[PDB]
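Example 5.3 — zinc finger-containing protein 1
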Amino acid sequence: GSSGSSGVACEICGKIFRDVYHLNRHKLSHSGEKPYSCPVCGLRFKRKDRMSYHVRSHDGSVGKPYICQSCGKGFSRPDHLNGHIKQVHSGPSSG
Ligand SMILES: [Zn+2]
Ligand SMILES: [Zn+2]
Ligand SMILES: [Zn+2]
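Solution (predicted structure tokens):
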């Protein structure tokens, strides 16, 4: 480095500016999530082949209202979940 001067630091990319004015015009040039950016992370991609594997990779969704406490699948109704917990899960050494 060897460059520890007094200035500002962009809170988007991390670029340093000798003054604030030069940074004022930069913030305006910055893009707002595009063309293909992640709604979760925030990164920006210039391809649909990447963002597609990036977004899905996270899988942001719940689906059903109630979900198991183990496999966390999801059932339309509550009673349906009660039967699963006892069907698949719930099975101690004793009985
Ligand atoms: Zn910036
Ligand atoms: Zn992401
Ligand atoms: Zn389960």
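Remark. The pocket of zinc ion (ligand 2) is lined by residues 38, 40-41, 54-55, 58 (CB under 6 Å).
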